[PDB]
Design a protein around this ligand. Structure first.
Ligand SMILES: [Mg+2]
Ligand SMILES: [Mg+2]
Ligand SMILES: [Mg+2]
Ligand SMILES: [Mg+2]
Ligand SMILES: [Mg+2]
Ligand SMILES: [Mg+2]
Ligand SMILES: [Mg+2]
Ligand SMILES: [Mg+2]
Ligand SMILES: [Mg+2]
Ligand SMILES: [Mg+2]
Ligand SMILES: [Mg+2]
Ligand SMILES: [Mg+2]
Lengths: 117, 110, 56, 46
RNA sequence: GGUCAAGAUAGUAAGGGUCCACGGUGGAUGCCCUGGCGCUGGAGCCGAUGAAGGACGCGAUUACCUGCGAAAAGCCCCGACGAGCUGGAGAUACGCUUUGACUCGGGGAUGUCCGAAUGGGGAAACCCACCUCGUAAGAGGUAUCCGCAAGGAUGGGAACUCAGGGAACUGAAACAUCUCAGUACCUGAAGGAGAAGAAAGAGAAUUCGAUUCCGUUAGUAGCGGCGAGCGAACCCGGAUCAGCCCAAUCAAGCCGAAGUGGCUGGAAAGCUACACCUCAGAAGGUGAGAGUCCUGUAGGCGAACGAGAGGUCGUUGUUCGUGAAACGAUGACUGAAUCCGCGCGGACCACCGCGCAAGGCUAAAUACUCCCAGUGACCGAUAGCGCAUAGUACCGUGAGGGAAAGGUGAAAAGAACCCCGGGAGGGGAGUGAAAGAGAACCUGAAACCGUGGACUUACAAGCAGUCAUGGCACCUUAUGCGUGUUAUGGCGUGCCUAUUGAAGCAUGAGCCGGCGACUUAGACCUGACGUGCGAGCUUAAGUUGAAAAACGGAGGCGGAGCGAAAGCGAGUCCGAAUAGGGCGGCAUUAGUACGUCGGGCUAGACUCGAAACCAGGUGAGCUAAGCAUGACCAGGUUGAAA
RNA sequence: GUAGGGGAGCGUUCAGUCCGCGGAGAAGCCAUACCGGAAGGAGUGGUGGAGCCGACUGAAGUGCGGAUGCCGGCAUGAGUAACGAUAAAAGAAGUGAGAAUCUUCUUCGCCGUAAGGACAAGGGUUCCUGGGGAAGGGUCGUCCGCCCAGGGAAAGUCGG
RNA sequence: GAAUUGGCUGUAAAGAUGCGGCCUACCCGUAGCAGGACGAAAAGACCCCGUGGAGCUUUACUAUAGUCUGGCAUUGGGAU
């Protein structure tokens, strides 16, 4: 008995192909090139996934120190005084608190000032 | 390429017999046998029809036209079936002809 | 001997062919036989170009 | 220039000929072998 | 709200991108069979009454095949079938046939020319003769080779068999003996089979009894640069079994049991409600899926005619390579007995034991598959033979090589008629279930070419992505957990191999499809797991059944080790007894058969790739020369001997 | 985590058994936002016109991106290079669906020890006549050495 | 291989359009040029490697056609 490769390779390749959308030119059209693109695509996917958390870390900091500097502190000073109060484990996403809510971050700045001198 | 030569290509019916139609269309409808073609298993019966045109680019009053023609058929039909419907006859014998067989199911006359 | 290095792309070739658009004849109605013919030429239809010239 | 092939009726025949191919038995070998090999026809008809 | 100023900001797409929609190109995939493949079985030679294979002919119309053969797609006799027939052929015309055509069997009858070719010649199918018979037309004879004569042979055959002749690559990781292997190749002879055969034997029992074949002995006994490697035979189990002469039933075929109504449908053999046969439910066909619709099947019958010696020298064979080399076999030279005789038993002698050479024949068990049949955890259109027929097209002076190849529809109903056009091609009409089947006619993938739409793009440095947010658009796993597109930000050195190290300016590759590489075999070896019996465990060939498996103890493995062996034995070895090697006891360690898998060995051994080596043939129509025989060199200048 | 060892599995063909599905439509093919730890597998939709899932076991010609791998088809270069001798053409006329290319006329240029003529060898109806316009013709084509049909070849003395 | 294919300087398997930093640069063509794409072409013919090959050579090894030579055979007689 003999089992040809019939109807197998094709389904496989279409599965590969289908991931490809805004993929430019032969990347979205020819198989081998597509699949191959999806190797490096693997790399960037996973690695930059672990990375995105570094990225948002960066963003929020970049905001918080901004509000801080606006009110007379800075990130070093503000977070120092915050931690210096066992009070605020506030920490995470405090950025938006500084962005949307002016008087709140004014109270946090004043408070963190108390916890310094 | 095969083709109707399946059977031993003998014929259960004859050129002169009256026959009705098993299955098909014109089921139950009947007619005299006109052409019996054994090899290609093709039976012409007077009852079953096709209305069909011939091509004359210029031929025989070129003036194209359409005919009333006969619908040629397969083994679907029954030989001379006496009690007023189709029935499948086998047995043979001889009566007034010692040189020949005959046919029936329940009856004896075809 | 100076061969091309890569197949040029669908996009690059279709880009080069960008300029090949045919420039459709600007036609004009013949004043005499009133059918459309061309400037500074004889109207093929009537044969009339300022009075009448070709045997039509 | 002048090619390899200079067609000759009394040559193509005097060698390769069924007669010629029958003159020797390595020839007649070629014959019957050619026969069984399907119908591969011998030069008098070729 | 009008003009100055300073700002910011949209849109346009020449062309591009992504997605979507719709075509085109192509022919993958699914379906199918009109074709293959090998298993088992059957059958097995044809030709001087002319083979095999062809040439040219034959047809109302004939180019290809088929079939024949100047009596030509046929002719006559017998048998069967009993309405059709007039070959593939689609096609008009002419007809033939119950005074039995056609078709199927069975004998004869004609059979052009070539070819063993055979009157003579010849570049096969052609050119020339002679002797008879005589009325021309036309028939008959005229090769050599055996023989009184009758008669026999020359040729052909896929594989198989015997024989004359006889390779190398390769292996020994180099290479001479060795291995490849008496393999391949050539040649001779012949049949359906051949070969072989009726003991001057095998052999160690005062056993056996022709040959061949299978299992087995047995990877044993042996041969070997004792290297690589090579490798019996007797016994025993089976298949089948004979020894005789001589020299003083199966083919044509015929017969065959049993269903109707309603329903979906284009169409039913399907569903359904009731019913029937079955020494017949194996199978194919019939508009779809079939016992009871056709052919069939089980069963039954069935014909005129037809089949069923010794030595020496050079050497060689078998396990036998010169080895202690016996024996058979011969090329040369030699060339004994014959019945108180003669050859053998592995140098040789005696004894002892088997055996009668120098003459022939001789079914069966065996091998093979051109052909036919039946089957298949065999292929199904890049598969399967190369061919769904082709050794054709096509390549070559030739020997030789060598293709792709399939699908309307259930039925031609194969599309009158109308419209654009010379046409091609399309659009209507009509048929049809379907023309979403229309003859570039099953599905119709991907590359690749277009048309339309959506969001987008004309200060931007780019492995084409990935992440994150915004804009626009869409809502059939689908109002979000979204899908499509996009603007900006962040990040970001193709894949593969080969490598110390690859984005590499190192390999490979245009793109998509399909083809495409770690197998198979043996009663081999060794392990893991699993089963069955278990101090025991199994069979091999074969025999008999064969919708099935049983029988078969010849043999193999355990069961005792030690040694160079004789031998001895829970002991055995070396040696004059004590030291040790091996080992049994163990404190206790069970096997064998089968299966799957992990390896090993022998074969191509994962697939692809050499330069080369050897055998048999084809080539001097190109070119290198010879031979025989022909042809050719305008015109002018120079001015030798005599 | 590379060679390498070990374990679980996914898919394809055939096979036996079981459950079954199909003209109110099978396989295949096409789209898809769902499921699954992955190989993968479902759901609905669109094509299609006969067949086919699933479970359990068994057997493999059983899984491709590469091998300058094989067959086929289709791209790139790109409407690029070329159209095969630098012996030139020109006008009228005709035909035709359509003519720079066919026909005729009138000129022009080219060979003229040839680029004329007659045979051999070889080719095999290419000749003539009448039609044709798919392909062949390097453009065109009404034309041809192309396609169709019918005709044509005559020897006592020439060559055998 | 696919490309959406600039410049300098540096780094990288040591000669970067594709890495870094800095400069430059609107979109698409046509005629041209040959510096780069270690541009194409041919599994480098040089060199080395292979217990690869083949032609040739000779006082390398080994065999052998051929040839010389003793005996035996055809192959006999007589004198000495
Ligand atoms: Mg535009
Ligand atoms: Mg050698
Ligand atoms: Mg070797
Ligand atoms: Mg189609
Ligand atoms: Mg790979
Ligand atoms: Mg160019
Ligand atoms: Mg140019
Ligand atoms: Mg043309
Ligand atoms: Mg140039
Ligand atoms: Mg180069
Ligand atoms: Mg090299
Ligand atoms: Mg050289």
């Amino acid at each position: 008995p003999r089992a040809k490769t019939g109807i197998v390779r094709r389904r496989r390749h279409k599965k590969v192909l289908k991931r490809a959308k805004g993929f430019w030119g032969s990347r979205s059209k020819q198989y081998r090139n597509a699949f191959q693109t999806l190797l490096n695509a693997a790399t960037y996917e996973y690695r930059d996934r672990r990375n995105k958390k570094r990225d948002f870390r960066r963003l929020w900091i970049q905001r918080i120190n901004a509000g801080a500097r606006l009110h007379g502190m800075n990130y070093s000073t503000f977070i120092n005084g915050l931690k210096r109060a066992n009070i605020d484990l506030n920490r995470k996403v405090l950025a938006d608190i500084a962005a949307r809510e002016p008087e709140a971050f004014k109270a946090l700045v004043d408070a963190s000032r108390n916890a310094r001198q | 390429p095969s083709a109707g030569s399946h059977h031993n290509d003998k014929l259960h019916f004859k050129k002169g017999d009256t026959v009705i139609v098993l299955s098909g269309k014109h089921k139950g409808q009947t007619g005299k046998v006109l052409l019996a073609l054994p090899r290609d298993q093709k039976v012409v019966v007077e009852g079953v029809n096709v209305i069909t045109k011939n091509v004359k680019p210029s031929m025989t009053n070129p003036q194209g036209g359409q005919e009333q023609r006969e619908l040629a058929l397969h083994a679907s039909k029954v030989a001379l079936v006496d009690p007023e419907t189709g029935k499948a006859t086998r047995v043979r014998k001889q009566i007034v002809d010692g040189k020949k067989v005959r046919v029936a199911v329940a009856s004896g006359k075809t | 001997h100076p061969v091309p290095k890569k197949k040029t792309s669908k996009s690059k070739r279709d880009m080069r062919r960008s300029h090949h658009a045919l420039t459709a004849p600007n036609l004009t109605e013949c004043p005499q036989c009133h059918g459309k013919k061309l400037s500074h030429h004889i109207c093929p239809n009537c044969g009339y170009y300022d009075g009448r010239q070709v045997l039509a | 220039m002048k090619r390899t092939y200079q067609p000759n009726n009394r040559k193509r025949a005097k060698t390769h000929g069924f007669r010629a191919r029958m003159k020797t038995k390595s020839g007649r070998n070629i014959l019957a072998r050619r026969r069984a090999k399907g119908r591969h026809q011998l030069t008098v008809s070729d």
